[PDB]
Structures are given as C-alpha cells and as structure tokens.
C-alpha cells in the first residue's frame, strides 16, 4: 500500500514499495504545479516519472533513527511488518523530522489537525523516563530523543497530525542533557545561530527541551506549520551510514561548495566556517553531515538552518581513558601533511590553510578567529552566570577550562 506524502496538508506525492522491494517515488502533477512546489529533497529534483534511484530509499531511510536496535523498539511498539524503512514509516510516519507527513494510501482518516493532551507533571515524568527502558512522531539523530508540543504553560502531547514544538532529549556521557544545554547557551552568546533550549524537570528525571526551528505557527495562530528541511546526508542522497566524513560522508569542501548555491550563500558559508572553529574550541566531535541542515524553499531554494545537536566531549576526560589528544573533529581541516582533525593539535594556521584551498575569504577567516579571540572570555561568564543553581559545575568547569586552553592559542595570535 502506497504511502501518500503530505507537506502541511498538501499532496506532494506517493512512496511506493514494489514487489521486488524497490522503493520509488512520484511527484503529484498537482504538486509540480503548486505555488508551494519544491522537491522533497534536493537529492530528488522535481520531475514527472517514477523516481527509482537509491536517493529515494536513502531519503526516507534518513527520517528514521540510526540505531538498528532502536528500530526494533519501534517494530515492537507499533507492531511493524519489518524494520524496513517503508514498513516503519507506515506506523510513525506522521510527525517525522523536516516537514513530511507519510500517511498510508488507504487511510484518509482525517486526523485532528490541532489536538493535544495537557500532560501532568507525572505523565511527563512517565513519558520522559519512558524512552530508556496518539504518539506517532519520528526524531532522527545520534542519541535517544522524543518530541513534545509546548502550549501556554503545559507540556502537551500531540494528537493526530498535530505538530510538536520541542525536541526533548533524555540523559544517555552521564549528563548529555546538561552538556548540550551549556553548549547551546554558549553558542548563542557568541552570535552563532542556534535554537533556544531549556531544561525540564519532571520528578526525578531531567530532560532537555530544544525549541524546533522547523516549526512555526501561522499568522492566525490557528495552525502549527512544519517547515521543510533536510540534513546533509539527504541533500546528497547518501545513507546515514556515511554521515561521518571518515566513513565517506561530506566534508568542508563538499558542504562549502553546496552552500554557494544558498539564497544566503555568502552569509551561510561564513557561518559554516565560523562553526568549524566553535566546534574546535568546545571540543565538539559530532559535527557529522546529519548535524547540518538546509531549509527547502519554494522553487528549490535553500539556506542553512540553525545549528543543533551540539555537545562538548570535554567532560569525558582524565578520570577515564579519554584524553584531549584523543578528540578529533568529524570534518577535517587542511594541514601541511594531508589533513588534520586532532583538536589538541589544531591551530589557527589550519583554519587558514583550509580557507586557502576552499578559497573562502582569507580576511573573513582572520575576522572569525579574531572575534572569538576577544569574545570567548566574556562569553563564558554570561553563560555561567546563567546556568541554573543546580547545574553540574564539573560540566561548566571541564568545558570552560578546556575552552580557555584552546582559546589561548587564539588570543596568542589575535
């Protein structure tokens, strides 16, 4: 049974799984002519026939969680006919990342467009703690996370094809929730485009609540709209199995070249490189392709989305085996001897060497390093004097401590 692909209650097309198990997709003629017309994914450009390339399979596969174990948790819950992307998506296809809503062909079953259940502080504590040992969502990423709808002053669960407004993350790293909450506050303090996140406390459980940037209420405030988007694995039609550059995923050059075609190209390119430096300063090593996204706009235009899923690997050193010399950036920089990626061995000359080959304005690479050189100090303070009274000072200190260590490498030159 074909899966009708909707995008904000607009028929875009259908997903078909043939007998031979070949996934195919076909744009709806009405969509090809729509005002809102745009490809589901840049890897699937609007055209007339049945699209049969692997990009079709990879695109939809990238909407589901990475872990083959987690998928089992899904086949278990909503009794799926297989761990196959198509079968799974036929169960939780409603609130998937980005803005697609996959609903079986045989299933108009008009679902409530705007419906939710105001959870109690207990039910919340139940749902949060739940993900460890109507709710048809789908959050893709590296770790275990769900998604809720925030309205008024209550955390409510969507009912039907109703959208969510927050991506909620649970503690895995011993305090991944606190690690990310910090990295995000710091990111904002430094002018990087990131989502405002908060920490929700339900009884004993402690969870992270990130505001979604792929969700927006219409002017009337009567409808919550999903904004189309896709990560860099999708954009390039690649399988999440290659999200890291070392495995075969896209790197700086690939991404940077692609960003040249952005509606906000010059700004996005600047912002992308700037972030390569930030990831270095806070020892973030999760900067893989599925962690960068572009918004898809009417006609096929796209621009970089805010950065997300940021965590520092600093809190995981010393006491254990892990050492600063064992931290490597997911995307390499240009070095004299091939390429570099070891945080503790990385120096400004590396970002400048990268900029040289990519031909990214040298002067802008200098200004990026310069801005950080003189802003980190003040940044840490404001962030710190923001951390809630009950924030693990070992997280603050581990991050703050190592940032200054690397920062010094900057101020020493800028």
């Amino acid at each position: 049974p074909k899966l009708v692909t909707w995008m904000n209650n607009q028929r875009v097309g259908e997903l078909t799984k043939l007998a031979n198990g070949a996934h195919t997709f076909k744009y709806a003629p009405e969509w090809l002519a729509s005002r809102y017309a745009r490809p589901l994914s840049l890897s699937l450009p609007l055209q007339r026939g049945n699209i049969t390339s692997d990009a079709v399979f990879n695109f939809f596969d990238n909407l589901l969680p990475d872990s083959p174990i987690v998928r089992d948790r899904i086949v278990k819950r909503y009794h799926a006919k297989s761990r196959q992307p198509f079968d799974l998506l036929s169960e939780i296809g409603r609130d998937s990342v980005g803005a697609v809503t996959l609903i079986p062909e045989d299933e108009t079953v008009t679902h409530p467009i705007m419906a939710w259940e105001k959870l109690t502080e207990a039910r919340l504590e139940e749902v949060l703690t739940a993900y460890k040992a109507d709710f048809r969502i789908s959050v893709a990423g590296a770790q275990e996370k769900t998604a809720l709808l925030r309205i008024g002053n209550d955390w409510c669960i969507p009912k039907g094809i109703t959208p969510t407004t927050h991506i909620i993350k649970l503690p895995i790293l011993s305090q991944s929730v606190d690690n990310e909450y910090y990295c995000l506050l710091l990111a904002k303090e430094l002018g990087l485009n990131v989502p405002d996140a908060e920490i929700i406390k339900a009884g004993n459980v402690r969870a992270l609540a990130v505001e979604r940037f792929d969700r927006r209420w219409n002017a009337e405030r009567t409808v919550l709209l999903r904004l189309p988007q896709e990560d860099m694995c999708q954009t390039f039609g690649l399988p999440s199995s290659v999200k890291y550059e070392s495995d075969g995923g896209p790197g700086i050059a690939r991404i940077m070249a692609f960003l040249m075609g952005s509606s906000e190209a010059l700004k996005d390119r600047y912002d992308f490189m700037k972030f390569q430096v930030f990831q270095w300063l806070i020892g973030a090593t999760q900067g893989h392709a599925k962690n960068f996204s572009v918004f898809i706009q009417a006609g096929g235009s796209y621009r970089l989305t805010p950065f997300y899923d940021i965590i520092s690997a600093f809190p995981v050193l010393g006491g254990t085996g892990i050492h600063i010399s064992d931290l490597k950036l997911a995307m390499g920089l240009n070095a004299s001897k091939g390429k570099k990626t070891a945080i503790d061995k990385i120096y400004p000359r590396h970002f400048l060497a990268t900029a040289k080959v990519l031909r990214f304005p040298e002067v802008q690479m200098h200004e990026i390093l310069s801005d950080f050189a003189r802003m980190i100090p003040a940044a840490l303070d404001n962030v710190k004097t923001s951390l809630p009274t009950d924030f693990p000072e070992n997280v603050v200190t581990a991050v703050e401590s190592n940032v200054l260590r690397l920062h010094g490498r900057l101020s020493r030159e800028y």
């Binding site: 450009p45 055209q47 040249m260 075609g261 190209a265 006609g299 096929g300 235009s301």
Partner: protein, 71 residues
C-alpha cells in the same frame, strides 16, 4: 517567479520544463545546433557548462531569463 541560485537548481528547473512540455533532448538539440550529449551533460552536470550552451537550450525551451535581487 522562483529565484535560482546555482547551476543545479537551474538545470533541475529547465529539465522540469522540458518534461512538462513533452520534449526530448534530441528535438531541442537539433533545433539549436548542439549535440544531444550536451543537453544531457547540462541536465546532470551543469556546473562546468558554457553560457552560450545554456542560452541555446534556453531558447529551445521557448524560455528567457531575468535578473533580480535576492531580497
């Protein structure tokens, strides 16, 4: 209309128009004096494509282009 910012967004668009009009790479290529391979390259690898090529194909599609601000 929709603003375009890259060779690829361009080719996707132009290829859509050719398909929506029922034309093949052959009939268009004959009309404008270029090889069918050229049209094929343009549709799949527009980055290193010549501008005359681009305009000849634009003419064969009974289309034209215009500049504008990116807002």
């Amino acid at each position: 209309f929709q603003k375009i910012y890259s060779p690829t967004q361009l080719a996707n668009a132009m290829k859509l128009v050719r398909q929506q009009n029922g034309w093949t790479q052959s009939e268009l290529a004959k009309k404008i004096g270029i090889k069918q391979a050229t049209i094929s390259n343009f549709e799949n690898n527009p980055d290193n494509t010549t501008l005359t090529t681009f305009f000849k194909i634009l003419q064969s599609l009974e289309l034209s282009m215009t500049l504008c601000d990116a807002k």
